[PDB]
Design a protein around this ligand. Structure first.
Ligand SMILES: NC(=O)C1=CN([C@@H]2O[C@H](COP(=O)(O)OP(=O)(O)OC[C@H]3O[C@@H](n4cnc5c(N)ncnc54)[C@H](O)[C@@H]3O)[C@@H](O)[C@H]2O)C=CC1
Ligand SMILES: NC(=O)C1=CN([C@@H]2O[C@H](COP(=O)(O)OP(=O)(O)OC[C@H]3O[C@@H](n4cnc5c(N)ncnc54)[C@H](O)[C@@H]3O)[C@@H](O)[C@H]2O)C=CC1
Ligand SMILES: NC(=O)C1=CN([C@@H]2O[C@H](COP(=O)(O)OP(=O)(O)OC[C@H]3O[C@@H](n4cnc5c(N)ncnc54)[C@H](O)[C@@H]3O)[C@@H](O)[C@H]2O)C=CC1
Ligand SMILES: NC(=O)C1=CN([C@@H]2O[C@H](COP(=O)(O)OP(=O)(O)OC[C@H]3O[C@@H](n4cnc5c(N)ncnc54)[C@H](O)[C@@H]3O)[C@@H](O)[C@H]2O)C=CC1
Lengths: 496, 125, 246, 246
């Protein structure tokens, strides 16, 4: 259990000691062999720290006429691609050290999935439990005015997003406050925050974003013929079990899509219990049983299991829990050949070394958890084109399909047609369920499955160009650094 | 390169590459059409039990797996450079210019730049 | 033959006396069963009136060197989704009471078809019959300067459109006046009005827009199996006559 | 006891029937003796009406969680010299007819004393007696946001001032609302309203302004040797009584 801000910065320094060499060689300029070294080591010192960090102070007036001082933070890590995107967290333990960390983490997270804008993060030292619903909107509406006047919110500067203790109703309050004070003459006013409710610009299928992400994360690797042979199994979810920790947002919306494609769920544990069933659990009913209770203790169709769920037999274990969950305590006691991460820093750098020594292909969190960052990029475009997706094309592309079928029909009945037999070419019962219900939701769940795939092939590749074997986490950071480097180098960092 | 310079300006102005939101969507729609042709035939010839493997060509597969932004550019260009020739061919007849094309080029330009000053009220008075 | 402004507002009050009940039940909050009533009845009082109404006055100089005072109006009904869209009418009988009405009418018209921007409307007390073609562009070009300086025209605020006595050539004059005085540094400058001619941004197939609309309006209902049985006919335009007024 | 809006406009029409003649003669241009007439009568038709008039509507939330709709007005008479200055009145009987009147009245009041900016006036249909001190600042702070977004408040556009039922504490609420939302990057932000308290820019000796005015008003005439002889008294306040109403 090490400090966190040391962990993140620990990876960067490690992943820069690898790329540094293969990166000098691929430079083009009239310099020595040593002036290049002083150029690479130097840019890598510019990418590492956080450019801007703010710190605020609020005169809020409580409901009982009192006054008190709220205290916030916001750190923008990089400016290499604008805007910057980063959630807002309400918690009494939001230091300035953890805001710098999580900000830097997104600049690399949204680089492995080729999402343009850079990284940011905000925090506010309160406990939302201890405030009414009119005290919250007082705190939220003013936290934006005292933050947009100094250029830290805007459709082209920063785009806040939801986070822990911050739902949609906090994104509505930010958008209206911005859109009516300072972004009034701005056509892109409502593109200042993502995560808004559907009725005010929000996209469809957003709460299942990290869910669909976690799914497509592992599918690209299970099918990879090479990395499977080493682990000792066959491609495809056929005959593959899995287990799930932390049954909630990331867990429920990910059990479904796995369970729908063959993968047999086995055990589902939580912070207050666990469930064991070598026969298979139905996610829906498992949700339903909780939709009226609040806890899964005593599910009907699966028995009880208590203790550590990480030490359980499985084939694909997912830690949806919180950080610093899996260490030298039980690193030789997982029994699973894949550990796909679902949260921030599930694994300590110690277990990472043991896992390389045990033919375990741990999939990094920087990648998988990408998820709701991608859809947050799609919402920003929806709010920036001022039209939903496909409205102008669904019925047009519908007619073009029926004219192709009617073309195949005519063309055949010019050859077999003298026999008089008609040939009714018609859509399938599934491809019809795809035309009649074609909505925006389909384009989102498509552009996501294309990001999460084009991006894996780049991590697989980098894991070979440097001979990293089954160390993926390092290959994740190596792609990020190697792409963020190509932007400072070909820009002339200094304005002198 | 003037046309592609216009496409780059739009790329930088939509804040997204071309087709990112549509490649995998239009990929699935192609395979559901083929699987539709297969099913529909095997309802007529299908009692014979013969399967009919409708599959993409080796070229149309090299077009799906490598579908990138580069394809849309080399397409929107071949559409500009064609829709525009038909307008020079035409003008070369509406004025009986024969095989003088250069003049017909300038005549299209002037005749389009004219329709913008005329229907605008050049003077702001 | 009743007054018109009463008719529109008459529907809203009627249609709010219906939805009011099924709407309290579908609210989620920590309130009484009566604090919700005071929340629904209250929002429905905010949607009803018109937020902004303007009123202008122009020093136009006639062709014969004379002067006279043109007098205009523009009402933006709602601000819930921006911009606002609404035509401009030239008529000697454009009161301020009928501009409020037609503005409110569009906020609901463009909501049943899920078009985002809200409702607006403008009017100018003239008779275009009694003016040359240089007097009109004097009236139109200035009606925009005295209306964009107060934030009632712009690609993200209001988007005027054509209406009776106002063709395309009146949308060209508005766009050039805006795009060269105040929206000069604005990349979206020419998106301040719709209905422009084709040569300056106008779309194709616009004069047949209400036409195609009226067509697809009835086709969706003729095919509806339920509402047809009651009327007593069969789906499809087969064997169906029709007539046309105007 | 005649209508008021008729009185003001009654003076202008009367006072223009006098100056019209001595004003044609002092023009310099190449025109007829009749083209000048058509130039004077014409400008005098442009000065008479009110250029801009607005009309608003507010979603205010009462202290008891309720909602209601406040309804305001603001009329800028002339634009010949900017900004425009005019008080704000809170009264349940603030029509749009009396706002046009009082606006025109200031354009001429601040012209006889050579004060540059032109005339304006605002009103809000409430009764301040029937509102708490947190309901008032809700009404006042929003009446400025819904009025500065349409360019009717600003150091160089309009400068509101106090009036009946509107003291200093209403000028503080306007200035802070403006200076922190929309005039943030503006060095002259706090010059958007006058009448503020001393601690925030207000001048000294302001409550005695009309007082000192009324004094120096009569002193310049009592000393005038001509107009006194006709009245039948001697210059100077010596031996002069007076009385005071209100
Ligand atoms: N040849 C290679 O090694 C790679 C090629 N690509 C290509 O890029 C094209 C489309 O990628 P897009 O990024 O969608 O299009 P784009 O045309 O808009 O990409 C601009 C460039 O910036 C990089 N980039 C994207 N997001 C970034 C971020 N947040 N920070 C730093 N760099 C970032 C991309 O990899 C790309 O090279 C395709 O042609 C794809 O094959 C992408 C990655 C690697
Ligand atoms: N929701 C999202 O879009 C994203 C969430 N995350 C991260 O995922 C993590 C949780 O996922 P959420 O989406 O927040 O879902 P959630 O809030 O619905 O997750 C809570 C779940 O974790 C379980 N849990 C908590 N502590 C546990 C412990 N020590 N042992 C076992 N189970 C425990 C709870 O019982 C519950 O099932 C967090 O670290 C969060 O920051 C990261 C990126 C995106
Ligand atoms: N479930 C339901 O009852 C309805 C669902 N929808 C869905 O909305 C999606 C696409 O609708 P779009 O509006 O095109 O996309 P969008 O994603 O941009 O729509 C935003 C939301 O605002 C509403 N809206 C649209 N224009 C409005 C206006 N002028 N004033 C107030 N509200 C307005 C829409 O109904 C929608 O719920 C589809 O998924 C469609 O099924 C639309 C209407 C009803
Ligand atoms: N010769 C004459 O009949 C008059 C001469 N003056 C002279 O003006 C000078 C200083 O006057 P200021 O106005 O203080 O200086 P200024 O130099 O700034 O005055 C500009 C001109 O605009 C006029 N003016 C002032 N406020 C006005 C308003 N609100 N609307 C329309 N016109 C307005 C003034 O009378 C002056 O002629 C002195 O030389 C004084 O004698 C002033 C009045 C009459």
């Amino acid at each position: 259990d090490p400090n966190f801000f040391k962990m993140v910065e620990g990876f960067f320094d490690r992943g820069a000691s690898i790329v540094e060499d293969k990166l000098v060689e691929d430079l083009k300029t009239r310099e020595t062999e040593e002036q290049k070294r002083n150029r690479v080591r130097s840019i890598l010192r510019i990418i590492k720290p956080c450019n801007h960090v703010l710190s605020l102070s609020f005169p809020i007036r409580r409901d009982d006429g009192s006054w008190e001082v709220i205290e916030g933070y916001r750190a923008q890590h990089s400016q290499h691609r604008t805007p910057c995107k980063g959630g807002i967290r309400y918690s009494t333990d939001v230091s300035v050290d953890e805001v710098k960390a999580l900000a830097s983490l997104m600049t690399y997270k949204c680089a492995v999935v080729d999402v343009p804008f850079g990284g940011a993060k905000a925090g506010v030292k309160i406990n939302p439990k201890n405030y009414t619903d009119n005290e919250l909107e007082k705190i939220t509406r003013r936290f934006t005015m005292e933050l947009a006047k100094k250029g830290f919110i805007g459709p082209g500067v920063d785009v806040p997003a939801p986070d822990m203790s911050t739902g949609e109703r906090e994104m509505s309050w930010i958008a209206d406050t911005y859109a009516s004070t300072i972004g009034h003459y701005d056509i892109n006013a409502h593109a200042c925050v993502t995560g808004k409710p559907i009725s005010q610009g929000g996209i469809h299928g957003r709460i299942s974003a990290t869910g669909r992400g976690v799914f497509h994360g592992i599918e690209n690797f299970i099918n990879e013929a090479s990395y499977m042979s080493i682990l000792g199994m066959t491609p495809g979810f056929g005959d593959k079990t899995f287990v799930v920790q932390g049954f909630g947002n990331v867990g429920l919306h990910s059990m479904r899509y796995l369970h729908r494609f063959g993968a047999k769920c086995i055990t589902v544990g939580e912070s207050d219990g666990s469930i064991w069933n070598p026969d298979g659990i139905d996610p829906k009913e498992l949700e339903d049983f909780k939709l009226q209770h609040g806890t899964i203790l005593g599910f009907p169709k699966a028995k009880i299991y208590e203790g550590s769920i990480l030490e359980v037999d499985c084939d694909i274990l997912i830690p949806a829990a919180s950080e610093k969950q899996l260490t030298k305590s039980n690193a030789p006691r997982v029994k699973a050949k894949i550990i796909a991460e679902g949260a921030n820093g599930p694994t300590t750098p110690e277990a990472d070394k043991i896992f390389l020594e045990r033919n375990i292909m741990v999939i990094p969190d920087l990648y998988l958890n990408a998820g709701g960052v991608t859809v947050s990029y799609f919402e920003w475009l929806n709010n920036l084109n001022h039209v939903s997706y496909g409205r102008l094309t669904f019925k047009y592309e519908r007619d073009s399909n029926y004219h192709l079928l009617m073309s195949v029909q005519e063309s055949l009945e010019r050859k077999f047609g003298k026999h008089g037999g008609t040939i009714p070419i018609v859509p399938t019962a599934e491809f019809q369920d795809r035309i009649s219900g074609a909505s925006e939701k389909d384009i989102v769940h498509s552009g996501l499955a294309y990001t999460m795939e084009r991006s894996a092939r780049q991590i697989m590749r980098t894991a070979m160009k440097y001979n990293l074997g089954l160390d993926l986490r390092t290959a994740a950071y190596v792609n990020a650094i190697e792409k963020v480097f190509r932007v400072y180098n070909e820009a002339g960092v200094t304005f002198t």
